[PDB]
Amino acid sequence: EWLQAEIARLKGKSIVPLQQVKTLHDWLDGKRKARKSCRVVGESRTGKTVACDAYRYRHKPQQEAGRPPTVPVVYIRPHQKCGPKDLFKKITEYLKYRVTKGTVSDFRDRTIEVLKGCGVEMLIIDEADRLKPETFADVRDIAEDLGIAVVLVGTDRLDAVIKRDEQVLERFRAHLRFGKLSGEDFKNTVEMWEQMVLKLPVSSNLKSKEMLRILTSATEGYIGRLDEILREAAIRSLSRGLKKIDKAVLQEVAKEY
Amino acid sequence: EWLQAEIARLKGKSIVPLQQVKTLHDWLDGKRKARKSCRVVGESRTGKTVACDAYRYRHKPQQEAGRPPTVPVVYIRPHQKCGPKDLFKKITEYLKYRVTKGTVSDFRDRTIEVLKGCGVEMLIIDEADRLKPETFADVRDIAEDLGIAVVLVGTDRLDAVIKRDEQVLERFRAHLRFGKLSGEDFKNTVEMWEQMVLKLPVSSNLKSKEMLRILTSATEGYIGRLDEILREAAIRSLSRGLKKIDKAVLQEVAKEY
Amino acid sequence: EWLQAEIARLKGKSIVPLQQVKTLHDWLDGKRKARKSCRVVGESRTGKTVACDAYRYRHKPQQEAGRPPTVPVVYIRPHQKCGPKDLFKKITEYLKYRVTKGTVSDFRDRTIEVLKGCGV
Amino acid sequence: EWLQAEIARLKGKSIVPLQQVKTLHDWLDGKRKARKSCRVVGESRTGKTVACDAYRYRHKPQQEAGRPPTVPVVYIRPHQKCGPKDLFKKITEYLKYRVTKGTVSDFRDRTIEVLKGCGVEMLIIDEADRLKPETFADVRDIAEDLGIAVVLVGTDRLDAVIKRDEQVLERFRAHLRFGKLSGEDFKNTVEMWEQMVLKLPVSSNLKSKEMLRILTSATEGYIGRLDEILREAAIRSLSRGLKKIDKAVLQEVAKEY
DNA sequence: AAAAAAAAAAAAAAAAAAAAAAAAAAA
DNA sequence: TTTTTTTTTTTTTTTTTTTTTTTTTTT
Ligand SMILES: Nc1ncnc2c1ncn2[C@@H]1O[C@H](COP(=O)(O)OP(=O)(O)O)[C@@H](O)[C@H]1O
Ligand SMILES: Nc1ncnc2c1ncn2[C@@H]1O[C@H](COP(=O)(O)OP(=O)(O)O)[C@@H](O)[C@H]1O
Ligand SMILES: Nc1ncnc2c1ncn2[C@@H]1O[C@H](COP(=O)(O)OP(=O)(O)O)[C@@H](O)[C@H]1O
Ligand SMILES: Nc1ncnc2c1ncn2[C@@H]1O[C@H](COP(=O)(O)OP(=O)(O)O)[C@@H](O)[C@H]1O
């Protein structure tokens, strides 16, 4: 069944180029060449993790000689209430280096060693709100001991937590802020996203004022909502024998959430 | 590329002789001759750590005999929540010795042994606030047992840390303060920074009011912010093919950082 | 005094180039390029230790780049009845790395990692 | 340099199919289907290690199912004086499962769990002659509690340890010899060797009376001994400029080793 | 009414001894 | 062989701080 193949294909995830993504990539590349630490602030379901992650694929570490890998960008997602030891362990795990059983001071020394051996000019920390207040001192300690840029990606809680300590705030003053979709930006994004993700036999008439209206009402500018809504509508539309997404199907999916 | 060589020179660190650095150096020489302990208190981005390093560099340990080399000055920066054993390890790692597996009492003894063997006319400890209270007791123990002076570099909170212990208040009464740059001092230094650090082929006249307002407003009298801004502005200007920093280039960095 | 200077010089150390040393050095370069193990056999007070020590200085480590140093030749002198743990300690300390505490297996893993990092 | 490229090729490692290797592979497949433990005894420098490794390469991990890797064959190389903890830990790490730090009882249970989750039809221990006698009992316990066939790859030292326990000798009765080459087998192997490893613009005529006599005197039926000889003679000849191995060069190489 | 001072409950991090068993060694 | 002798290897009791939550008080 061809429909089965399309269902399986849609149930996946794909990357669709966007302007804000390119802006973030260029800004972060500038910071990486300057070795200047910074932070990034945005709302949930805006796709900032996808931008931080898509950037790292381009700069994947490649080593041809017998010497160990030289990695320029390392990327870790801390768990809830991640402490100092837990964070160091993740840095070591990402570099495919054997964790040494021992104490926290041993973890600190080992982390400095593995980071000194490789490049690791830029470190992208996601979900920085979850980071425990005790650990930020270690983060900036690393940023000062070695010339490595540190990027703290978080929401408004990141702002709130950072502004409580003077040194951390001084270290991470420069920043980039994400926005939401609206107007022509939103319409162009919907058109581009459907052309990039949907290969349905017939057009969905997305440009129509009414479809844009209901998608705006259900989306509110959050790409993390538009992607899910349109993918579910597509799977359901194809499942009922409709090659294209239809107005009633859109209304149904929007009503469920 | 020649521009890349100039940029690499701008990225590298250097030290400019300044009024505050010389003041601290003369004070420290007096204290070590008196063998008296004291404190150094200042704000962030004031360059007091750099001044300590510049002091250490002048007193090079020269051995003119077969007997072990003698170190007159020791410098340590403890890690977060440094305990007694960690500090003793730092002392014995700074000096060219090793410590075998053993107890805290053994570490105390080995540290005292190498401290007696070495000269250690003065001991400088950065970031005093991080030290644990028991570690403070041990620092005082060393200062009282051996003819060695102890300098506790600290921020505004150093007084608060030492207010919970009457004994350190009794022995560390003398103190020196670091301040900020304002008025004529800031302007004089700025001219010196343009001529002594930057590789700018053509002078940009930073002391002029048009370019003074920007530097002064963003910097707020902190040395670190100023040097950061100037190095970055020079790098950006040379990358653009300029032999002199333009007004727009100087203004962009301030807002970005 | 002239005499004291000459006497102090005489009581020091010096090296006389010999055909034995050059022979050893050519042979060792061959073995190093071929990555083959071998033996050096000789009586005491013949200075074979000095010849090997001199071989070491010809190929010095390069740390011009920011990366860890890549010393191609390591030279150690085990003490009497040296156990395996202590041999690993010698290797790790020579290359200027911290020796993690633990069992002989931990030292073994640490030493292999360091030996892969450097040229050796 | 083209010559250096050919030399780099000659300094590499290749694999050549021999009847000895195919015999071992068929025998091992039989034992794995039968789920019966056994052992292989063969002299040093025979290449049995390489034959077992090639066998492992024949059956790659089967991730075709959605949840676990389902690797049917594992292969571990114990270190000298391998204890039970190190053995269990190597087995665990080979299956990409984290080590649950604890006591040897925890390692035992964890290893059993990961061996049950994966297929693990057969387990191969390379150079088992340095496996501690305490741990052979653990190996037998694994072979009994789980439907796993265990193959021991060791030489003459295996049996002098196995015969120290009545229980272990019953498990590994099926034995296969793995010895040297001689006569027509040796001559055929040499010609195959001269064709596969010495892609050479000029035949060295190794399949001849005197060349075979030299190689036999130096080789004594050991392929491992022969490897260095032939590869190194080819490299030396090509470095000097000779397109093939002259008899004098071969004799010189043999004298060196 | 609505901010400011007060008893349980979880959770994380670190040496310092002691015993036993095995393996190698020396006359 | 008898004993020594060490050498690992593996298996075991005390000390301290930090949140959160909640209930009474006062103002
Ligand atoms: N550039 C993009 N291309 C395609 N889908 C995207 C993109 N950015 C976000 N998405 C969708 O949004 C989700 C990712 O958003 P998320 O990483 O949760 O945002 P954040 O982590 O910044 O809160 C994914 O499920 C994906 O489908
Ligand atoms: N005398 C100096 N010469 C050059 N640069 C200086 C000097 N003093 C401070 N700086 C700048 O300030 C930074 C050092 O500040 P820092 O080490 O944080 O001192 P502190 O710990 O006292 O704040 C350096 O990056 C350096 O560029
Ligand atoms: N090539 C040499 N030139 C000068 N003196 C030498 C040379 N080789 C050895 N010696 C002398 O011999 C001593 C070193 O010999 P040593 O290294 O003990 O030999 P081995 O260790 O092989 O017994 C030194 O004290 C040195 O004076
Ligand atoms: N079938 C083969 N193909 C290629 N090389 C082989 C083969 N058999 C043996 N060799 C050579 O012999 C060596 C393998 O010997 P090894 O695995 O050490 O035997 P063991 O460890 O059983 O003594 C390798 O260096 C390899 O070059």
Residue C19 contacts strand F, CB under 7 A: no
Tell me the structure's resolution in angstroms, rounded to a single decimal: 3.8
The neighbour count for residue B155, using CB atoms within 10 Å, is 21
B197, B223, B229, B231: which to mutate for ligand 2, most atoms within 8 A of CB?
B223
Residue D238, CB-side half-sphere exposure with 13 Å CA sphere: 24
Q: Give the tokens for residue A240.
A: 């009922």
* DSSP label of D7: H
Within a domain: residue C41?
A: yes
Nearest one of C66, C59, C114, C62 to C88, comparing CA atoms: C114
Q: What is the β-pairing status of strands B149-154 and B175-177?
A: unpaired
Give the C-alpha separation, D131 to B2, whole Å.
61
Residue B104, CB-side half-sphere exposure with 13 Å CA sphere: 8
* Nucleotide nearest residue A134, measured CA to C1': F18
Ordered alpha helix ranges (H), D79-222: 84-94, 104-117, 133-145, 157-162, 166-171, 183-196, 209-219
Nearest one of A27, A23, A28 to A121, comparing CA atoms: A28
State the smallest CA–CA distance between residue B247 and chain A in angstroms: 20
* Residues ≥6 apart with Cβ < 8 Å to A186: A212, A216, A219, A221
Q: Give the tokens for residue A230.
A: 């349109």
| Residue with tokens 């009011």, as numbered in its chain | B209
**CA dihedral sign of residues B27, B32, B38, B41:** positive
Q: What is the β-pairing status of strands B149-154 and B122-125?
A: parallel
Within a domain: residue C77?
A: yes
Give the C-alpha separation, D226 to D181, whole Å.
11
Residue A133 contacts strand F, CB under 7 A: yes
Q: Find, in chain C, the residue whose alpha carbon is nearest to that of D231.
A: C34
CB pairs A-B closer than 8 Å: 21
R_g of chain C computed on alpha carbons: 18
CA of B134 to C1' of F18 (A): 19
User: What CATH number is given to the structural domain containing B70?
Assistant: 3.40.50.300
Strand-pair partners of A151: A38, A124
CA of A126 to C1' of E3 (A): 36
Query: Angle B79-B83-B88 (CA atoms, 0-180°, nearest 5)?
Result: 90
Give the C-alpha separation, D131 to D150, whole Å.
14
Ligand 3 within 6 A of CB of C16: yes
Residues in chain D whose beta carbon is closer than 8 A to a beta carbon of chain C?
79, 81, 83, 86, 228, 232
* SS3 label, residue D213: helix
* DSSP label of D31: H
Contact A84, A135 (CB under 8 A): yes
Contact A194, A204 (CB under 8 A): yes
Contact A244, A200 (CB under 8 A): yes
* Residues ≥6 apart with Cβ < 8 Å to B235: A34, B7, B10, B11
> Per the CB < 8 Å rule, is B44 touching A170?
yes
State the smallest CA–CA distance between residue A219 and chain B in angstroms: 32
Helix or strand run (H / E) with residue C58: helix C48-58
Experimental technique of record? cryo-EM
Structural domain count of chain C: 1
Contact B200, B234 (CB under 8 A): yes
Question: HEC profile for chain A?
Answer: CHHHHHHHHHCCCCCCCCHHHHHHHHHHHHHHHHCCCEEEECCCCCCHHHHHHHHHHHCCCCCCCCCCCCCCEEEECCCCCCCHHHHHHHHHHHCCCCCCCCCHHHHHHHHHHHHHHCCCCEEEECCHHHCCCCCHHHHHHHHHHCCCEEEEEECHHHHHHHCCCHHHHHHCCCEEECCCCCHHHHHHHHHHHHHHHCCCCCCCCCCCHHHHHHHHHHHCCCHHHHHHHHHHHHHHHHHCCCCCCCHHHHHHHHHHC
* SS3 label, residue B120: coil
> Per the CB < 8 Å rule, is C108 touching D79?
yes
Q: A64 is in which domain, residue-wise?
A: 19-177
* Residues ≥6 apart with Cβ < 8 Å to B188: none
Contact D190, D206 (CB under 8 A): yes
Using a 7 Å cut-off to protein CB atoms, list the covered nucleotides of chain F. 7-12, 19-20
Contact A99, A89 (CB under 8 A): yes
Taking the C-alpha atoms of B9, B14, B18 and B22 in order, what is their torsion angle to the nearest 10 degrees? -160
Residue C82 contacts strand F, CB under 7 A: no
Closest ligand to B192 CA? 2
CA of D216 to C1' of F15 (A): 72
Contact D245, D204 (CB under 8 A): yes
Contact B169, B141 (CB under 8 A): no
Nearest one of D197, D128, D184 to D157, comparing CA atoms: D128
* SS3 label, residue B107: helix
Nearest one of D69, D241, D78 to D153, comparing CA atoms: D78
* Residues ≥6 apart with Cβ < 8 Å to B107: B84, B85, B88, B89, B92, B99
* SS3 label, residue D76: strand
Contact D169, D161 (CB under 8 A): no
Complete edge-to-edge strand list for the sheet that includes strand D73-76:
D73-76, D122-126, D149-154, D38-42, D175-178
Residue C72 contacts strand F, CB under 7 A: no
Q: Give the tokens for residue B202.
A: 């053509």
CA distance to A53, A111, A116, C105, D136, per residue, from A93 (Å)? 17, 10, 15, 20, 33
Q: How far apart are the first and last CA of chain A?
A: 30
Task: Find the residues whose C-beta lies inside 6 A of ligand 2.
Answer: B 13-16, 18, 21, 44-50, 223-224, 227
Residue bearing the CA closest to ligand 1, atom 18? A45
Angle between helices A223-239 and A247-256 (to 10 degrees): 120
Among C38, C104, C105, the strongest candidate for a mutation testing the D interface, having the largest count of D CBs within 10 A, is: C105
Nearest one of D22, D28, D52 to D174, comparing CA atoms: D28
The alpha carbon of residue C17 and the mean position of all alpha carbons in its chain are separated, in whole angstroms, by: 19
Residue B192, CB-side half-sphere exposure with 13 Å CA sphere: 12
Residue bearing the CA closest to ligand 3, atom 4? C15
Give the C-alpha separation, A148 to A142, whole Å.
8
Backbone angles phi, psi at B122, to 5 degrees: -140, 150
Ligand 3 within 6 A of CB of C20: no
Q: How far is the CA of A180 from the centre of ligand 1 (A)?
A: 13
* DSSP label of D241: T
Residue A236's region, left for phi above 0, alpha for psi from -120 to 50, else beta, is alpha
Nearest one of A107, A175, A99, A111 to A146, comparing CA atoms: A111
Within a domain: residue C68?
A: yes
Give the C-alpha separation, A209 to D6, whole Å.
69
Give the C-alpha separation, A24 to A178, whole Å.
9
Residues in chain C whose beta carbon is closer than 8 A to a beta carbon of chain A?
67-68, 70, 97-98, 100-102, 109-110, 113, 116-117
The neighbour count for residue B132, using CB atoms within 10 Å, is 15
Strand F proximal residues, C:26-55, Cβ < 7 Å: none
The alpha carbon of residue A158 and the mean position of all alpha carbons in its chain are separated, in whole angstroms, by: 15
The neighbour count for residue C18, using CB atoms within 10 Å, is 12
Contact D133, D169 (CB under 8 A): no
